[PDB]
Design a protein around this ligand. Structure first.
Ligand SMILES: [Mg+2]
Lengths: 549, 400
DNA sequence: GGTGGGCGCCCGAACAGGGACTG
DNA sequence: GTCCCTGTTCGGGCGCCC
């Protein structure tokens, strides 16, 4: 049926005509079954518009479908505010005495289209047999590929399930598109007979529920998983074991993996996924890299080994426990009692040229938080690979305002740390190094160097370079010609900025070394002075490096 | 028959489309609670996806109590609505009370063909339903436009209270009512409750303080101690061109080990003395321009020690501040920062009448995850997330 | 082949912002 | 103004769902 629900007004963008083209081949006829159902009416040829059409087949080949390419209409219809904000998660289901999972039948085709807009959805079959001026329908229901349908349908669904959701403030219905899951505080046969009053509700509004009525049938199927009374698991995932690999071939993988990594802990994808780096091709083959292949090896390992998830309760409490995986990667996992996982994840995002393990830890804690608020709607308690103290260190000296929430030290190696601190105070004893670099921006030739109280002076001429770079090279000379204790005086804020921030990794080879040498050092004191203002001995270095440029 | 005034947006601009962000069960639930009333009582309606626009909502526990307020982040819709003097004596009253009125604006019906911009969306814990959307039919709280339209009648309302009580200045920015008096506190509140009983139909401005730039006092100096001096001075330059560094940066002539002691010369010890005076002087050339963005920034010194400045033009600071929070074994940077920004925005409003744009010393993700927990005002200032040069921290720093 | 919407993950394009520079 | 060099937004590919 078509629903009795009031219809939803949609315009075209502020100045468009509507679509219009034609198409062409044994044109087959479901298109009259719709006629007698009200879902399309026939139209008189002073309706200007036409949109192409065609046929294919079902996403589970049981029917040999029809479809319209509103790809033109879509591009001229008003914008919407879509209303699916996210995908519900199983791990966020707090389990109810009784349950069902039913689906609406033929639902797009069950809600009316605004009539002031139906004309635009006018499509026209070629001919009954290859030529006569053919037939011409509009739609009276939500079409199967117009950008309006989903948003509008979802709204309508909601706006209908409404009186059930208050006539029962307390039976829980998870609604994703045209699919339902039902949750009841009632014993099976009052649920059973409550699920009826529901089905009958939808019917009254024009939504039928065939079977398709997942019943006394745990495992319920829902949302791509396999719910149970007490656990849940992902319908098995099979890895693209394609002995040669191209890009799209690998994206196939990582995507299965990220989907995988929501329940199978440990899943990690750093090396697969720097393979896309640089490319200009989408199909271009990619030689499986050594650390990659070795990494790829690891994942297939995990998924063999089977696992489940669990449900939630406002009763017991949420825990998140992060663990340092490899290079810039992390693996979390939320639960409520010890080895019973509730959800897990994977934060590997690389934000910055230069970072250290404590900011990645911060980001991960950030990702996991907002996400918990999304699923369970509250912030968790954490357990983190970093000693209560390292944090206070960091949170003391770092100049930006940072903050991790209610947490407690777990002892899961690798542990997080700051591979070196800078000195607050200059070093009695240490050579005091004055560094400075220059570089001609025409010639891209440069210079970096140093000058100490003990009167020492290098001056390496760099090439194909930038001013910023040389100023970081000079800090680099200084550290590698200085012994285990050293003060340095740079004129560059750019440099002072990176290093104060205490990087253990960066995109730069220069900074990655400057980090090496910083760890090897015993005490450093980095000090700044304004450039080109005649200071001792920022003056002396500054000429050293500045003749030639 | 209660009549409606047409309104619309900056020319060529379109209404907001801002994504709603994750709320907490307690925030949604409190939002679903007052949205129910808010439509029943005929103040908002419900709307489908055919409304392309959207502006975010969360919910604030405006007291220690159990009465939630809902504010809409109209910053975006605000800065697209066509707009249009300021009581100078309010900043200088013994104490000011800030009322939240507030539930007054629903009294006037918003113009229909504008309602479509007021649309917002209430999410679902774990996404168990699509979002439910509403749209205002009556001047919403938090929009530049409500206080506007309503002033007409606010002024009728206040007429006799402003007249009878001459010594008091009442001010209206957004949902807030800032009222001020030289009354002793206690005589003040009895008056402010007299206001509240009328409208049925704590700030101490004179105490706010500027933290100037200050030079290190010590009885011996190192190369290093001077280098940190010359450079700070060198920067103060751009502010007080009446500064002087040359006779002092002469001391660092050769290539001296950071730790070696320099003695200050006849002039040096007087140049520095002449400088520490110039910094007492009022910055010359600063004139609040009403049509320019007000720019506030903030640096985190340490130990609940926050410093701000507020300026429209670089180096022409209208106010340097130091805001001091807690030094704790349970301290919250974001919470503090949240508190800083609010306090600052409040002087900002009290003094100049408008609200600043903040340059926040914090990672955007970090700030966006939490600021909603620790907020308490019925407005929201525009902000961008900076990364601070750890240098310009030393400049404004304090010394024990 | 020629179908819509949603969230996620990555990555590269476009920028924005600053801070140094040239003669 | 020009360079650098950081950050950010966005759109494309895939994953998964209806
Ligand atoms: Mg230099």
């Amino acid at each position: 049926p078509i629903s009795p629900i009031e219809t939803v007004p949609v315009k075209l963008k502020p100045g468009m005509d509507g679509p219009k083209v034609k198409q062409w081949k044994a044109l087959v006829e479901i298109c009259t079954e719709m006629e007698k159902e009200g879902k399309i009416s026939k139209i008189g040829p002073e309706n200007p518009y036409n949109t192409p059409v065609f046929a294919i087949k079902k996403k589970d080949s049981t029917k040999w479908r029809k479809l319209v390419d509103f790809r033109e209409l879509n591009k001229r219809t008003q914008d919407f505010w879509e209303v699916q904000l996210g995908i519900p998660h199983p791990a966020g289901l707090k389990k109810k005495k009784s349950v069902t999972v039913l689906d609406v039948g033929d639902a797009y085709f069950s809600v009316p289209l605004d009539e002031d807009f139906r004309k635009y959805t006018a499509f026209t079959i070629p001919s009954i047999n290859n030529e006569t001026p053919g037939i011409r329908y509009q739609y009276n229901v939500l079409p199967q590929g117009w950008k309006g349908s989903p948003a509008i349908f979802q709204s309508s669904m909601t706006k209908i399930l409404e009186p059930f959701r208050k006539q029962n403030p307390d039976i829980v219905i998870y609604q994703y598109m045209d699919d339902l899951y039902v949750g009841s505080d009632l014993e099976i046969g009052q649920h059973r007979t409550k699920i009826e009053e529901l089905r009958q509700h939808l019917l009254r509004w024009g939504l039928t529920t065939p079977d398709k009525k997942h019943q006394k049938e745990p495992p319920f199927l829902w949302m791509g998983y396999e719910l149970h009374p007490d656990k849940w698991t992902v319908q098995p995932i099979v890895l693209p074991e394609k002995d040669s690999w191209t890009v799209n071939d690998i994206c196939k993988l990582v995507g299965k993996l990220n989907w995988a990594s929501q329940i199978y802990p440990g899943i990690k994808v750093r090396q697969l996924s720097k393979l896309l780096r640089g490319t200009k091709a989408l199909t271009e083959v990619i030689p499986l890299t050594e650390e990659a292949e070795l990494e790829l090896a690891e994942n297939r390992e995990i998924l063999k080994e089977p696992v489940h998830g669990v449900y939630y309760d406002p009763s017991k409490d949420l825990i998140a426990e992060i663990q340092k995986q490899g290079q810039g990667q992390w693996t979390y996992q939320i639960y409520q009692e010890p080895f019973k996982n509730l959800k897990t994840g994977k934060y590997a995002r690389m934000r910055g040229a230069h970072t250290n393990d404590v900011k990645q830890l911060t980001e991960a804690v950030q990702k996991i938080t907002t996400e918990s608020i999304v699923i369970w709607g509250k912030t968790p308690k954490f357990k983190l690979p970093i000693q209560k103290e390292t944090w206070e260190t960091w949170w003391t000296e770092y100049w930006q305002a940072t903050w991790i929430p209610e947490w407690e030290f777990v002892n899961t190696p690798p542990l997080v740390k700051l591979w070196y601190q800078l000195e607050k105070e200059p070093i009695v004893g240490a050579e005091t190094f004055y560094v400075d670099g220059a570089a001609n921006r025409e010639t891209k030739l440069g210079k970096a160097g140093y000058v100490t109280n003990r009167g020492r002076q290098k001056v390496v001429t760099l090439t194909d370079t930038t001013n910023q770079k040389t100023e970081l090279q000079a800090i680099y000379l200084a550290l590698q010609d200085s012994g285990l204790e050293v003060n340095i005086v740079t004129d560059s804020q750019y440099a002072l900025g990176i290093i104060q921030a205490q990087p253990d990794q960066s995109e730069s080879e220069l900074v990655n070394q400057i980090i090496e040498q910083l760890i090897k050092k015993e005490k450093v004191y980095l000090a700044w002075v304004p450039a080109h203002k005649g200071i001792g001995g920022n003056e002396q270095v500054d000429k050293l490096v500045s003749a030639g440029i | 028959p209660i009549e409606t005034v047409p309104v619309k947006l900056k020319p060529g601009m379109d209404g907001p489309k801002v994504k709603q962000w994750p709320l907490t069960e307690e925030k949604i639930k409190a939002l679903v609670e007052i949205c129910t009333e808010m439509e029943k009582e005929g103040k908002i309606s419900k709307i489908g996806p055919e409304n392309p626009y959207n502006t975010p909502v969360f919910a604030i526990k405006k007291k220690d109590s159990t009465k939630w307020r809902k504010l809409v982040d109209f910053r975006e819709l605000n800065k697209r609505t066509q707009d249009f003097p300021h009581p100078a004596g309010l900043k200088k009253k013994k104490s000011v009370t800030v009322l939240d009125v507030g539930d007054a604006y629903f009294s006037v019906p918003l113009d229909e063909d504008f309602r479509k911009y007021t649309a917002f969306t209430i999410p679902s814990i774990n996404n168990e339903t699509p979002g439910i959307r509403y749209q205002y039919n009556v001047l919403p709280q938090g929009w530049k436009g409500s206080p506007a339209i309503f002033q007409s009648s606010m002024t009728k309302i206040l007429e006799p209270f402003r007249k009878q009580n001459p010594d008091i200045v009442i001010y209206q920015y957004m949902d807030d009512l800032y009222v001020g008096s030289d009354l002793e506190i206690g005589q003040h509140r009895t008056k402010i409750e007299e206001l509240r009983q009328h409208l049925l139909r704590e700030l101490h401005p004179d105490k706010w303080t500027v933290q100037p730039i200050v030079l290190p006092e010590k009885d011996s100096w190192t190369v290093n101690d001077i280098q940190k001096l010359v450079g700070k001075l060198n920067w103060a330059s751009q502010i007080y061109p009446g500064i002087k560094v040359r006779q002092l940066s002469k001391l660092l002539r050769g290539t001296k080990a950071l730790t070696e002691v320099i003695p200050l010369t006849e002039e040096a010890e007087l140049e520095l003395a002449e400088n520490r005076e110039i910094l007492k002087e009022p910055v010359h050339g600063v004139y609040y321009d009403p049509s320019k963005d007000l720019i506030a920034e903030i640096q985190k010194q340490g130990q609940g020690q926050w410093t701000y400045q507020i300026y429209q033009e670089p180096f022409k600071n209208l106010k340097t501040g130091k805001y001091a929070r807690m030094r704790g074994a349970h301290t919250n940077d974001v919470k503090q920062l949240t508190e800083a920004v609010q306090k600052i925005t409040t002087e900002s409003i009290v003094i100049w009448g408008k609200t600043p744009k903040f340059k926040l010393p914090i990672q955007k993700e970090t700030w966006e995850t939490w600021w909603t927990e620790y907020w308490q005002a019925t407005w929201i200032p525009e902000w961008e997330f900076v990364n601070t040069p750890p240098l310009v921290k030393l400049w404004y720093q304090l010394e024990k």
